[PDB]
Protein backbone atom coordinates (compact mmCIF):
# COMPACT_ATOMS: atom_id res chain seq x y z
CA UNK A 1 0.00 0.00 0.00
CA UNK A 2 2.02 2.96 -1.31
CA UNK A 3 1.62 5.94 0.99
CA UNK A 4 0.20 8.11 -1.80
CA UNK A 5 -2.63 5.63 -2.39
CA UNK A 6 -3.17 5.21 1.36
CA UNK A 7 -3.44 8.97 1.92
CA UNK A 8 -5.75 9.94 -0.95
CA UNK A 9 -8.12 7.05 -0.22
CA UNK A 10 -8.40 7.62 3.53
CA UNK A 11 -8.62 11.40 3.27
CA UNK A 12 -11.45 11.13 0.74
CA UNK A 13 -13.45 8.21 2.12
CA UNK A 14 -13.35 8.95 5.86
CA UNK A 15 -15.25 12.27 5.49
CA UNK A 16 -17.62 10.66 2.98
CA UNK A 17 -18.56 7.95 5.49
CA UNK A 18 -19.11 10.60 8.17
CA UNK A 19 -21.11 12.97 5.96
CA UNK A 20 -23.33 10.24 4.49
CA UNK A 21 -23.53 8.20 7.73
CA UNK A 22 -22.52 5.05 5.86
CA UNK A 23 -22.37 2.06 8.25
CA UNK A 24 -19.69 0.10 6.38
CA UNK A 25 -17.63 0.47 3.23
CA UNK A 26 -15.04 -1.38 1.17
CA UNK A 27 -12.82 0.26 -1.46
CA UNK A 28 -10.40 -1.20 -4.01
CA UNK A 29 -7.96 0.90 -6.02
CA UNK A 30 -6.37 -0.69 -9.08
CA UNK A 31 -3.12 1.18 -9.70
CA UNK A 32 -0.82 0.18 -12.58
CA UNK A 33 -2.81 -3.06 -12.68
CA UNK A 34 -2.40 -4.08 -9.01
CA UNK A 35 -5.18 -4.00 -6.37
CA UNK A 36 -5.11 -2.26 -2.99
CA UNK A 37 -7.91 -2.77 -0.47
CA UNK A 38 -9.46 -0.62 2.26
CA UNK A 39 -12.33 -1.30 4.67
CA UNK A 40 -14.29 0.70 7.26
CA UNK A 41 -17.15 0.15 9.65
CA UNK A 42 -19.84 -2.49 9.98
CA UNK A 43 -21.33 -5.18 7.76
CA UNK A 44 -23.85 -5.90 10.56
CA UNK A 45 -24.42 -3.12 13.10
CA UNK A 46 -26.43 -5.22 15.56
CA UNK A 47 -24.00 -8.16 15.56
CA UNK A 48 -20.93 -5.85 15.49
CA UNK A 49 -19.51 -7.62 12.40
CA UNK A 50 -16.87 -5.52 10.61
CA UNK A 51 -16.48 -5.00 6.88
CA UNK A 52 -13.66 -7.23 5.64
CA UNK A 53 -12.18 -8.05 2.24
CA UNK A 54 -14.53 -11.07 2.24
CA UNK A 55 -17.77 -9.16 3.00
CA UNK A 56 -20.49 -9.58 0.37
CA UNK A 57 -22.29 -6.44 -0.85
CA UNK A 58 -25.35 -6.08 -3.07
CA UNK A 59 -24.11 -4.54 -6.33
CA UNK A 60 -27.50 -3.38 -7.51
CA UNK A 61 -27.31 -2.09 -11.07
CA UNK A 62 -23.56 -2.74 -11.31
CA UNK A 63 -24.89 -6.27 -12.00
CA UNK A 64 -25.85 -4.93 -15.43
CA UNK A 65 -22.14 -4.89 -16.35
CA UNK A 66 -22.06 -8.66 -15.80
CA UNK A 67 -25.22 -9.04 -17.90
CA UNK A 68 -23.71 -6.90 -20.67
CA UNK A 69 -20.53 -9.00 -20.76
CA UNK A 70 -22.41 -12.32 -20.67
CA UNK A 71 -24.47 -11.07 -23.60
CA UNK A 72 -21.30 -10.06 -25.41
CA UNK A 73 -19.95 -13.55 -24.84
CA UNK A 74 -23.09 -15.06 -26.37
CA UNK A 75 -22.66 -12.78 -29.39
CA UNK A 76 -19.01 -13.82 -29.72
CA UNK A 77 -20.03 -17.50 -29.53
CA UNK A 78 -22.45 -16.95 -32.43
CA UNK A 79 -25.49 -17.82 -30.31
CA UNK A 80 -27.18 -14.38 -30.73
CA UNK A 81 -26.78 -11.17 -32.72
CA UNK A 82 -27.64 -7.70 -31.43
CA UNK A 83 -29.32 -7.06 -34.80
CA UNK A 84 -31.70 -9.99 -34.13
CA UNK A 85 -35.38 -9.10 -33.58
CA UNK A 86 -36.56 -9.75 -30.05
CA UNK A 87 -39.21 -12.11 -31.42
CA UNK A 88 -36.55 -14.46 -32.79
CA UNK A 89 -35.86 -15.59 -29.21
CA UNK A 90 -39.42 -15.08 -27.89
CA UNK A 91 -41.86 -16.00 -30.68
CA UNK A 92 -44.82 -15.78 -28.27
CA UNK A 93 -44.18 -12.00 -28.25
CA UNK A 94 -46.63 -11.42 -31.09
CA UNK A 95 -47.93 -7.91 -30.33
CA UNK A 96 -47.25 -5.56 -33.24
CA UNK A 97 -45.31 -2.95 -31.27
CA UNK A 98 -42.39 -5.41 -31.09
CA UNK A 99 -41.76 -5.30 -34.85
CA UNK A 100 -38.44 -3.51 -35.20
CA UNK A 101 -37.28 -3.91 -31.59
CA UNK A 102 -33.90 -5.71 -31.59
CA UNK A 103 -31.75 -7.20 -28.84
CA UNK A 104 -29.56 -4.10 -29.20
CA UNK A 105 -32.51 -1.89 -28.22
CA UNK A 106 -33.21 -4.00 -25.13
CA UNK A 107 -29.56 -4.01 -24.08
CA UNK A 108 -29.18 -0.22 -24.38
CA UNK A 109 -32.55 1.10 -23.03
CA UNK A 110 -33.61 2.31 -26.50
CA UNK A 111 -36.64 0.08 -27.26
CA UNK A 112 -39.09 2.99 -26.95
CA UNK A 113 -39.72 3.52 -23.26
CA UNK A 114 -39.75 0.20 -21.44
CA UNK A 115 -40.35 1.09 -17.75
CA UNK A 116 -37.67 1.35 -15.08
CA UNK A 117 -39.24 -1.36 -12.91
CA UNK A 118 -40.97 -4.64 -13.60
CA UNK A 119 -44.22 -4.44 -11.59
CA UNK A 120 -44.27 -6.43 -8.36
CA UNK A 121 -47.35 -8.26 -9.64
CA UNK A 122 -45.22 -9.85 -12.38
CA UNK A 123 -43.76 -13.16 -11.21
CA UNK A 124 -44.24 -16.11 -13.58
CA UNK A 125 -43.06 -16.68 -17.13
CA UNK A 126 -46.67 -16.14 -18.23
CA UNK A 127 -47.00 -12.92 -16.18
CA UNK A 128 -43.84 -11.64 -17.85
CA UNK A 129 -45.12 -12.43 -21.36
CA UNK A 130 -48.37 -10.62 -20.57
CA UNK A 131 -46.50 -7.57 -19.26
CA UNK A 132 -44.34 -7.21 -22.37
CA UNK A 133 -47.30 -7.88 -24.68
CA UNK A 134 -49.37 -5.11 -23.11
CA UNK A 135 -46.56 -2.54 -22.92
CA UNK A 136 -47.18 0.45 -25.18
CA UNK A 137 -44.04 2.24 -26.42
CA UNK A 138 -44.04 6.00 -26.27
CA UNK A 139 -41.38 6.27 -28.98
CA UNK A 140 -40.07 4.52 -32.06
CA UNK A 141 -37.17 2.15 -31.34
CA UNK A 142 -33.71 3.64 -31.39
CA UNK A 143 -34.71 7.26 -30.74
CA UNK A 144 -34.65 7.88 -26.96
CA UNK A 145 -32.89 6.31 -23.97
CA UNK A 146 -34.80 5.56 -20.75
CA UNK A 147 -32.81 3.59 -18.16
CA UNK A 148 -34.82 0.47 -17.38
CA UNK A 149 -34.52 -2.86 -15.56
CA UNK A 150 -37.27 -4.27 -17.77
CA UNK A 151 -35.12 -3.54 -20.85
CA UNK A 152 -31.68 -4.93 -20.05
CA UNK A 153 -33.29 -7.58 -17.85
CA UNK A 154 -35.14 -9.02 -20.84
CA UNK A 155 -31.95 -8.81 -22.92
CA UNK A 156 -30.16 -10.98 -20.36
CA UNK A 157 -32.97 -13.53 -20.24
CA UNK A 158 -33.15 -13.83 -24.03
CA UNK A 159 -29.39 -13.80 -24.56
CA UNK A 160 -28.94 -17.10 -22.73
CA UNK A 161 -31.82 -18.96 -24.40
CA UNK A 162 -29.80 -20.57 -27.27
CA UNK A 163 -27.29 -21.89 -24.71
CA UNK A 164 -29.93 -23.99 -22.94
CA UNK A 165 -28.52 -22.85 -19.60
CA UNK A 166 -30.40 -20.92 -16.96
CA UNK A 167 -29.19 -17.33 -16.65
CA UNK A 168 -27.46 -18.09 -13.35
CA UNK A 169 -25.75 -21.21 -14.72
CA UNK A 170 -24.56 -19.36 -17.82
CA UNK A 171 -23.18 -16.50 -15.71
CA UNK A 172 -21.35 -18.96 -13.44
CA UNK A 173 -19.90 -21.12 -16.20
CA UNK A 174 -19.10 -18.42 -18.74
CA UNK A 175 -18.10 -15.38 -16.65
CA UNK A 176 -17.57 -16.00 -12.92
CA UNK A 177 -15.58 -19.25 -13.16
CA UNK A 178 -13.20 -18.27 -16.02
CA UNK A 179 -12.36 -15.00 -14.20
CA UNK A 180 -11.88 -16.73 -10.80
CA UNK A 181 -14.75 -14.74 -9.27
CA UNK A 182 -15.29 -17.42 -6.66
CA UNK A 183 -17.13 -15.25 -4.13
CA UNK A 184 -19.62 -13.66 -6.53
CA UNK A 185 -23.22 -14.89 -6.40
CA UNK A 186 -26.64 -14.35 -7.88
CA UNK A 187 -28.02 -16.31 -4.91
CA UNK A 188 -25.93 -16.21 -1.75
CA UNK A 189 -25.35 -19.79 -0.55
CA UNK A 190 -25.88 -20.60 3.14
CA UNK A 191 -22.12 -21.21 3.56
CA UNK A 192 -21.47 -17.57 2.70
CA UNK A 193 -24.23 -15.90 4.75
CA UNK A 194 -21.78 -15.12 7.57
CA UNK A 195 -20.16 -12.69 5.11
CA UNK A 196 -23.35 -11.19 3.63
CA UNK A 197 -23.57 -7.59 4.86
CA UNK A 198 -26.91 -6.12 5.79
CA UNK A 199 -28.11 -3.09 3.89
CA UNK A 200 -29.45 -0.14 5.85
CA UNK A 201 -32.47 1.91 4.78
CA UNK A 202 -33.90 4.43 7.27
CA UNK A 203 -31.91 2.63 9.97
CA UNK A 204 -33.48 -0.78 9.23
CA UNK A 205 -31.40 -3.78 8.16
CA UNK A 206 -32.60 -4.96 4.74
CA UNK A 207 -31.70 -7.32 1.89
CA UNK A 208 -32.93 -7.04 -1.69
CA UNK A 209 -36.30 -8.76 -2.22
CA UNK A 210 -36.95 -11.27 -5.03
CA UNK A 211 -38.40 -9.93 -8.26
CA UNK A 212 -38.93 -10.75 -11.89
CA UNK A 213 -35.68 -10.46 -13.88
CA UNK A 214 -33.81 -9.59 -10.65
CA UNK A 215 -30.81 -11.79 -11.48
CA UNK A 216 -30.41 -10.08 -14.88
CA UNK A 217 -30.87 -6.45 -13.77
CA UNK A 218 -29.71 -6.07 -10.17
CA UNK A 219 -29.05 -9.43 -8.60
CA UNK A 220 -25.29 -9.92 -8.13
CA UNK A 221 -23.54 -9.87 -4.74
CA UNK A 222 -19.74 -9.75 -4.50
CA UNK A 223 -16.68 -9.01 -2.35
CA UNK A 224 -14.24 -6.15 -2.82
CA UNK A 225 -11.58 -8.65 -3.93
CA UNK A 226 -13.76 -10.14 -6.65
CA UNK A 227 -14.81 -6.68 -7.81
CA UNK A 228 -11.18 -5.61 -8.13
CA UNK A 229 -10.64 -8.70 -10.31
CA UNK A 230 -13.70 -7.69 -12.34
CA UNK A 231 -12.12 -4.25 -12.90
CA UNK A 232 -8.76 -5.82 -13.84
CA UNK A 233 -10.53 -8.06 -16.37
CA UNK A 234 -12.33 -5.10 -17.93
CA UNK A 235 -9.14 -3.00 -17.97
CA UNK A 236 -7.18 -5.64 -19.94
CA UNK A 237 -9.55 -8.03 -21.74
CA UNK A 238 -6.75 -9.37 -23.97
CA UNK A 239 -5.06 -11.02 -20.98
CA UNK A 240 -8.15 -13.24 -20.71
CA UNK A 241 -7.48 -16.62 -22.31
CA UNK A 242 -11.09 -17.60 -23.03
CA UNK A 243 -11.57 -16.18 -26.51
CA UNK A 244 -15.30 -15.44 -26.54
CA UNK A 245 -15.14 -13.89 -23.06
CA UNK A 246 -12.31 -11.61 -24.17
CA UNK A 247 -14.45 -10.49 -27.11
CA UNK A 248 -17.58 -10.17 -24.97
CA UNK A 249 -15.83 -7.72 -22.64
CA UNK A 250 -14.69 -5.72 -25.66
CA UNK A 251 -18.26 -5.66 -27.03
CA UNK A 252 -19.70 -4.38 -23.75
CA UNK A 253 -17.33 -1.38 -23.87
CA UNK A 254 -18.26 -0.48 -27.46
CA UNK A 255 -20.10 2.84 -27.96
CA UNK A 256 -23.58 2.24 -29.39
CA UNK A 257 -25.42 5.52 -28.64
CA UNK A 258 -24.49 9.03 -27.58
CA UNK A 259 -26.46 11.32 -25.27
CA UNK A 260 -24.63 14.50 -24.35
CA UNK A 261 -21.11 13.55 -23.31
CA UNK A 262 -22.07 9.96 -22.42
CA UNK A 263 -21.83 6.82 -24.57
CA UNK A 264 -23.95 3.73 -23.88
CA UNK A 265 -22.29 0.30 -23.85
CA UNK A 266 -23.72 -3.05 -22.83
CA UNK A 267 -24.14 -2.35 -19.13
CA UNK A 268 -21.10 -0.09 -18.98
CA UNK A 269 -21.44 3.63 -19.70
CA UNK A 270 -18.50 5.64 -21.03
CA UNK A 271 -17.14 9.15 -21.47
CA UNK A 272 -14.06 10.39 -23.29
CA UNK A 273 -11.04 10.66 -21.00
CA UNK A 274 -10.02 13.21 -19.68
CA UNK A 275 -13.49 13.87 -18.21
CA UNK A 276 -14.79 17.04 -16.71
CA UNK A 277 -15.96 15.85 -13.25
CA UNK A 278 -19.16 17.91 -13.46
CA UNK A 279 -20.07 16.03 -16.65
CA UNK A 280 -20.06 12.76 -14.68
CA UNK A 281 -20.97 14.10 -11.22
CA UNK A 282 -24.16 15.78 -12.45
CA UNK A 283 -24.39 13.35 -15.39
CA UNK A 284 -25.22 10.31 -13.24
CA UNK A 285 -27.35 12.07 -10.57
CA UNK A 286 -30.24 9.84 -9.45
CA UNK A 287 -32.28 12.61 -7.87
CA UNK A 288 -34.23 12.13 -11.12
CA UNK A 289 -36.59 9.13 -11.06
CA UNK A 290 -37.13 9.10 -14.86
CA UNK A 291 -34.83 10.85 -17.37
CA UNK A 292 -35.82 10.49 -21.03
CA UNK A 293 -33.04 11.57 -23.39
CA UNK A 294 -32.76 11.62 -27.20
CA UNK A 295 -29.95 9.41 -28.50
CA UNK A 296 -27.73 9.61 -31.56
CA UNK A 297 -26.85 6.26 -33.11
CA UNK A 298 -23.14 5.55 -33.45
CA UNK A 299 -23.12 3.91 -36.88
CA UNK A 300 -21.29 1.56 -36.66
CA UNK A 301 -20.50 1.31 -32.92
CA UNK A 302 -17.04 2.46 -31.89
CA UNK A 303 -14.88 -0.41 -30.56
CA UNK A 304 -13.75 -0.07 -26.95
CA UNK A 305 -11.83 3.20 -26.62
CA UNK A 306 -8.91 2.86 -24.20
CA UNK A 307 -9.02 6.63 -23.57
CA UNK A 308 -12.34 6.44 -21.70
CA UNK A 309 -13.83 6.84 -18.26
CA UNK A 310 -15.88 3.61 -18.03
CA UNK A 311 -18.27 3.44 -15.10
CA UNK A 312 -21.51 2.23 -13.55
CA UNK A 313 -23.47 3.20 -10.45
CA UNK A 314 -25.66 0.71 -8.64
CA UNK A 315 -28.16 0.68 -5.82
CA UNK A 316 -30.56 -1.50 -3.93
CA UNK A 317 -32.80 -0.41 -1.09
CA UNK A 318 -29.94 -0.74 1.36
CA UNK A 319 -26.76 -0.60 -0.74
CA UNK A 320 -24.84 1.82 -2.93
CA UNK A 321 -22.05 0.79 -5.30
CA UNK A 322 -19.79 2.44 -7.86
CA UNK A 323 -17.16 1.21 -10.32
CA UNK A 324 -15.00 3.37 -12.59
CA UNK A 325 -11.83 2.64 -14.54
CA UNK A 326 -9.58 4.20 -17.19
CA UNK A 327 -8.09 1.57 -19.55
CA UNK A 328 -5.32 3.79 -20.94
CA UNK A 329 -4.03 4.49 -17.40
CA UNK A 330 -4.42 0.92 -15.99
CA UNK A 331 -6.36 2.71 -13.24
CA UNK A 332 -9.65 1.94 -11.50
CA UNK A 333 -11.72 2.03 -8.34
CA UNK A 334 -14.55 0.06 -6.70
CA UNK A 335 -16.67 1.54 -3.91
CA UNK A 336 -19.09 -0.77 -2.05
CA UNK A 337 -21.32 0.58 0.73
CA UNK A 338 -24.25 -0.77 2.73
CA UNK A 339 -26.27 2.42 2.43
CA UNK A 340 -27.83 3.84 -0.75
CA UNK A 341 -26.31 7.35 -0.65
CA UNK A 342 -26.37 10.02 -3.41
CA UNK A 343 -24.66 9.21 -6.71
CA UNK A 344 -22.93 12.64 -7.01
CA UNK A 345 -21.05 11.93 -3.77
CA UNK A 346 -19.86 8.57 -5.14
CA UNK A 347 -18.59 10.05 -8.41
CA UNK A 348 -16.96 13.02 -6.65
CA UNK A 349 -15.02 10.72 -4.30
CA UNK A 350 -13.99 8.39 -7.14
CA UNK A 351 -12.80 11.32 -9.26
CA UNK A 352 -10.81 12.85 -6.39
CA UNK A 353 -8.98 9.53 -5.94
CA UNK A 354 -8.34 8.62 -9.58
CA UNK A 355 -7.41 12.18 -10.57
CA UNK A 356 -4.85 12.27 -7.76
CA UNK A 357 -3.26 9.04 -9.02
CA UNK A 358 -3.25 9.57 -12.81
C1 LIG B 1 -34.98 2.51 -2.73
C2 LIG B 1 -35.03 1.10 -3.31
O1 LIG B 1 -35.75 0.28 -2.82
N1 LIG B 1 -34.19 0.76 -4.47
C3 LIG B 1 -33.26 1.68 -5.12
C4 LIG B 1 -32.60 0.91 -6.24
C5 LIG B 1 -33.17 -0.50 -6.18
C6 LIG B 1 -32.90 -1.62 -6.99
N2 LIG B 1 -31.90 -1.49 -8.06
S1 LIG B 1 -32.33 -0.86 -9.60
O2 LIG B 1 -33.79 -0.90 -9.78
O3 LIG B 1 -31.87 -1.80 -10.63
C7 LIG B 1 -31.68 0.83 -9.94
C8 LIG B 1 -32.61 1.77 -10.39
C9 LIG B 1 -32.21 3.07 -10.68
C10 LIG B 1 -30.89 3.44 -10.52
C11 LIG B 1 -29.95 2.51 -10.08
CL1 LIG B 1 -28.25 3.04 -9.89
C12 LIG B 1 -30.33 1.20 -9.78
O4 LIG B 1 -29.35 0.29 -9.32
C13 LIG B 1 -33.55 -2.83 -6.76
C14 LIG B 1 -34.49 -2.92 -5.73
C15 LIG B 1 -34.77 -1.81 -4.93
C16 LIG B 1 -34.10 -0.58 -5.15
Amino acid sequence: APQQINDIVHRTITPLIEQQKIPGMAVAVIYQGKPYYFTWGYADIAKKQPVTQQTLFELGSVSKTFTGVLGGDAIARGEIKLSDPTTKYWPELTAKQWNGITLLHLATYTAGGLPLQVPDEVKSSSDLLRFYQNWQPAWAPGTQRLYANSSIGLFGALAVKPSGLSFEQAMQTRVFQPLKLNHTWINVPPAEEKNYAWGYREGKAVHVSPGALDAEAYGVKSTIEDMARWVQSNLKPLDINEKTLQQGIQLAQSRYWQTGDMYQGLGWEMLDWPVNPDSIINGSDNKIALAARPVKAITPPTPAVRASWVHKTGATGGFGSYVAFIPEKELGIVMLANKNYPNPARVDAAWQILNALQ
Side-chain angles (χ1 to χ4, degrees):
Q3 188 166 27
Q4 183 196 20
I5 298 176
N6 180 86
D7 291 350
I8 193 61
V9 171
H10 282 282
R11 289 176 196 171
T12 302
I13 296 297
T14 286
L16 172 69
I17 288 168
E18 186 220 37
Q19 292 156 185
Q20 304 296 338
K21 306 209 188 60
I22 293 165
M25 189 147 182
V27 172
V29 169
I30 292 82
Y31 176 73
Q32 301 177 342
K34 325 171 295 311
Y36 303 93
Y37 305 111
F38 307 85
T39 65
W40 304 255
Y42 285 92
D44 184 331
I45 294 174
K47 295 194 180 177
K48 306 171 175 182
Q49 303 293 304
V51 174
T52 73
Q53 292 171 205
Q54 295 79 34
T55 295
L56 295 166
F57 290 82
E58 289 171 9
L59 302 183
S61 286
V62 168
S63 309
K64 296 175 173 66
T65 68
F66 291 93
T67 300
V69 168
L70 183 65
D73 172 84
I75 299 157
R77 293 170 177 268
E79 296 178 337
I80 65 172
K81 306 192 310 293
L82 289 176
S83 50
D84 282 335
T86 297
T87 50
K88 173 169 189 203
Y89 303 98
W90 208 0
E92 314 87 83
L93 204 59
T94 56
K96 64 203 211 326
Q97 69 270 24
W98 287 92
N99 294 324
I101 294 179
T102 67
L103 294 183
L104 170 72
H105 296 133
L106 297 180
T108 57
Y109 324 118
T110 52
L114 281 166
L116 171 58
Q117 298 128 317
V118 179
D120 271 48
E121 309 79 56
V122 178
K123 290 158 249 185
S124 69
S125 58
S126 68
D127 299 335
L128 208 56
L129 176 59
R130 183 168 60 219
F131 161 71
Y132 285 112
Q133 285 278 78
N134 289 332
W135 162 73
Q136 289 302 301
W139 318 304
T143 61
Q144 304 197 37
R145 176 188 184 276
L146 183 66
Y147 186 75
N149 291 336
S150 71
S151 191
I152 188 170
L154 179 56
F155 170 78
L158 300 183
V160 300
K161 276 189 175 349
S163 82
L165 307 174
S166 74
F167 182 82
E168 174 179 36
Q169 185 66 74
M171 187 68 77
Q172 289 170 334
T173 292
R174 294 177 169 193
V175 178
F176 294 168
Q177 287 169 10
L179 301 177
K180 316 287 212 322
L181 312 184
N182 296 320
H183 295 88
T184 301
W185 315 99
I186 288 163
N187 297 288
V188 182
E192 316 289 333
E193 289 180 9
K194 65 185 146 69
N195 285 319
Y196 189 5
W198 285 97
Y200 287 93
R201 181 179 187 263
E202 299 197 72
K204 195 167 187 172
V206 295
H207 281 155
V208 64
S209 305
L213 299 174
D214 56 2
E216 296 85 348
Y218 53 87
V220 177
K221 299 86 193 188
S222 190
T223 69
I224 201 66
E225 294 189 355
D226 271 18
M227 289 306 294
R229 191 155 185 101
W230 185 233
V231 170
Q232 290 177 310
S233 298
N234 280 268
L235 277 166
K236 299 216 140 167
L238 295 209
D239 282 351
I240 296 165
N241 287 120
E242 294 72 12
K243 300 136 302 304
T244 56
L245 182 54
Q246 174 188 139
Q247 180 69 13
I249 291 178
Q250 281 171 307
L251 299 175
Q253 284 179 51
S254 296
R255 306 179 172 188
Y256 297 91
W257 307 92
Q258 182 179 11
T259 172
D261 299 314
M262 186 259 285
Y263 302 92
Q264 183 63 59
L266 314 179
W268 293 113
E269 294 160 21
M270 291 82 47
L271 297 87
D272 285 320
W273 175 256
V275 278
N276 191 220
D278 259 351
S279 311
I280 37 178
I281 290 183
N282 318 290
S284 318
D285 174 285
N286 254 340
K287 279 249 64 170
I288 307 288
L290 175 166
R293 286 291 289 279
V295 282
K296 172 169 59 84
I298 303 305
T299 307
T302 303
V305 172
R306 289 185 77 254
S308 310
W309 175 282
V310 190
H311 71 161
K312 188 73 188 79
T313 65
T316 62
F319 288 85
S321 65
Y322 188 63
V323 174
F325 59 91
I326 306 163
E328 138 176 295
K329 299 302 209 286
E330 289 70 56
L331 188 65
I333 190 172
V334 183
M335 302 162 52
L336 305 179
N338 59 352
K339 185 183 192 305
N340 175 16
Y341 68 101
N343 282 340
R346 311 182 197 176
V347 177
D348 196 317
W351 190 82
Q352 291 285 348
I353 291 169
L354 291 197
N355 177 58
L357 301 174
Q358 53 107 2

